[PDB]
Amino acid sequence: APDEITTAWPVNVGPLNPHLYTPNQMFAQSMVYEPLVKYQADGSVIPWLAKSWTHSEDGKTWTFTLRDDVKFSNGEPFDAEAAAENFRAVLDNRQRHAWLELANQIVDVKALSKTELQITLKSAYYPFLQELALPRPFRFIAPSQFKNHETMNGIKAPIGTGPWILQESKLNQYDVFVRNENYWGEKPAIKKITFNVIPDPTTRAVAFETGDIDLLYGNEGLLPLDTFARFSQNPAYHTQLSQPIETVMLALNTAKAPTNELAVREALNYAVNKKSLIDNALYGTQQVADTLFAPSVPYANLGLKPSQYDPQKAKALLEKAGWTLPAGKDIREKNGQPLRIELSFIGTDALSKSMAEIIQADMRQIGADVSLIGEEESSIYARQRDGRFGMIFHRTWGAPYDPHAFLSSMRVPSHADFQAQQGLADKPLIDKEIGEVLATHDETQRQALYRDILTRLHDEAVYLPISYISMMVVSKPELGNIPYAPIATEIPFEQIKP
Numbered sequence: 470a471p472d473e474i475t476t477a478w479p480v481n482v483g484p485l486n487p488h489l490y491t492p493n494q495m496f497a498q499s500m501v502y503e504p505l506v507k508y509q510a511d512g513s514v515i516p517w518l519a520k521s522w523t524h525s526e527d528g529k530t531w532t533f534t535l536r537d538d539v540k541f542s543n544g545e546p547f548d549a550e551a552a553a554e555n556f557r558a559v560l561d562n563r564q565r566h567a568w569l570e571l572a573n574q575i576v577d578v579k580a581l582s583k584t585e586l587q588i589t590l591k592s593a594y595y596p597f598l599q600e601l602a603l604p605r606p607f608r609f610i611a612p613s614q615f616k617n618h619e620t621m622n623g624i625k626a627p628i629g630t631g632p633w634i635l636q637e638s639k640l641n642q643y644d645v646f647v648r649n650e651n652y653w654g655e656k657p658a659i660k661k662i663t664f665n666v667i668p669d670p671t672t673r674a675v676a677f678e679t680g681d682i683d684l685l686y687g688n689e690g691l692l693p694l695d696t697f698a699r700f701s702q703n704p705a706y707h708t709q710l711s712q713p714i715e716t717v718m719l720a721l722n723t724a725k726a727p728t729n730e731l732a733v734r735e736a737l738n739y740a741v742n743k744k745s746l747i748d749n750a751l752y753g754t755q756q757v758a759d760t761l762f763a764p765s766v767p768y769a770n771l772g773l774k775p776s777q778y779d780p781q782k783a784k785a786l787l788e789k790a791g792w793t794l795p796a797g798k799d800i801r802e803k804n805g806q807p808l809r810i811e812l813s814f815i816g817t818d819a820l821s822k823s824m825a826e827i828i829q830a831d832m833r834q835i836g837a838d839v840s841l842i843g844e845e846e847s848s849i850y851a852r853q854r855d856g857r858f859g860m861i862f863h864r865t866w867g868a869p870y871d872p873h874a875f876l877s878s879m880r881v882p883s884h885a886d887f888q889a890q891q892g893l894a895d896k897p898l899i900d901k902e903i904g905e906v907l908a909t910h911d912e913t914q915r916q917a918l919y920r921d922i923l924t925r926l927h928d929e930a931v932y933l934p935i936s937y938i939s940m941m942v943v944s945k946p947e948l949g950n951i952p953y954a955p956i957a958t959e960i961p962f963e964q965i966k967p
């Protein structure tokens with residue numbers, strides 16, 4: 470079975486509704502469904518299902534010329550009518566897509582002919598093409614598979630145009646994909662991919678050592694990092710670690726005592742020994758982060774000043790703000806109140822817990838009492854949406870989302886970043902500038918607005934950046950070098966070539 474592989478994922482791929490979110494998995498939606506335009510590593514898009522496009526002078530009306538040779542995997546044609554019908558299906562559920570500003574920008578979509586698709590926007594939104602390139606929601610399912618002329622209430626078969634077809638799924642067991650033998654583009658070398666559902670990282674590593682699976686591919690949570698390092702020395706296996714793809718950080722609640730105080734947030738940003746954290750909890754496998762976005766992120770090379778590990782300075786900042794230590798005690802107090810902060814995280818995530826214990830210890834050394842609140846996922850998501858946290862673990866979203874889409878979403882009240890920022894006097898100005906930057910085509914003004922937003926978020930110490938994390942791979946050697954997709958959340962199975 471040289472052209473069949475077995476891999477794993479912590480959950481099933483879901484129903485593969487192209488227009489909905491969890492329990493659908495972004496990498497599996499991208500295996501079956503395709504965009505008008507495809508994201509590239511240099512930050513551009515190339516023609517995909519749209520072979521070319523034009524736009525009006527005011528940048529609000531766009532017209533795409535679609536390929537005329539593409540079929541859905543069930544034989545039905547892909548054309549401008551089918552594409553228009555998918556946009557209607559997505560936007561009939563608009564409210565759900567509020568995080569993604571293109572969904573509020575699209576005013577009209579219509580098929581002018583079988584090959585001409587016209588999209589009209591509210592404003593000259595600059596990230597238009599990059600948001601059409603995302604895994605969801607602007608993909609394409611055969612309209613025959615709508616339920617009652619819609620997708621927001623479910624689909625029939627998950628029929629896309631892409632290079633893989635879902636063969637079958639068994640909840641809590643496995644998902645099987647096969648190559649689309651009528652694909653309009655390049656045939657994948659691999660014919661069949663089985664996903665074993667294996668939620669625990671330790672069990673994933675055991676499945677690979679026993680040879681039950683051929684490939685693990687994921688972020689820093691993929692398997693235990695000590696095990697990963699050991700596998701990278703084991704000549705029977707192959708391992709890889711990409712260049713960093715996004716940031717992991719704490720979000721600090723500027724609207725909740727005592728993180729509502731700038732001096733407290735500044736002191737916390739000097740309290741953590743990040744290098745030690747990464748060598749201790751992560752096994753030396755990741756990068757230290759000093760700012761929300763790494764300097765290599767577009768529009769984020771700003772010369773922002775790092776807060777290096779400096780307990781002396783953290784203590785001095787707290788002392789100056791009136792948080793001093795009472796005879797007998799190791800925890801500071803101001804106005805009778807102890808310097809106590811709750812750090813919420815997913816209680817069953819061993820790596821998260823690991824990091825939280827380190828953060829609690831480092832902060833105790835400067836006289837902050839961090840209480841760890843480890844809870845199930847739904848509970849932590851609820852806290853993020855509603856600002857019920859002191860500090861929370863968080864992360865950015867990688868290319869092509871960083872920085873524009875991650876910033877865009879800071880305006881949405883049901884997101885952790887809005888909630889963390891809600892206490893800032895300049896929050897309204899930041900949100901107004903985020904709206905401006907997304908529609909600004911004066912390149913000078915666009916860079917100025919990104920520098921201002923990112924600078925204010927850095928100076929206000931809203932985040933405690935921890936690490937810039939990478940994608941990791943463990944594979945049987947016979948699979949060869951495993952590529953990495955331009956979009957951080959996709960897996961390029963079509964590029965694997967034993």
Ligand SMILES: O=C(O)CN(CCN(CC(=O)O)Cc1ccccc1O)Cc1ccccc1
Pocket residue numbers: 490491495565566567568605865866867870884958
């Ligand atoms: O991740 C979130 O904060 C929420 N999601 C929206 C934003 N995410 C992109 C995506 O999921 O397609 C960001 C995102 C980017 C990169 C990897 C994973 C991601 O989840 C899901 C959701 C949508 C509507 C209402 C509630 C939740």
Ligand SMILES: [Cl-]
Pocket residue numbers: 491492493
């Ligand atoms: Cl999920």
Ligand SMILES: [Cl-]
Pocket residue numbers: 908909910911
């Ligand atoms: Cl402009």
Ligand SMILES: [Fe+3]
Pocket residue numbers: none
């Ligand atoms: Fe999401």
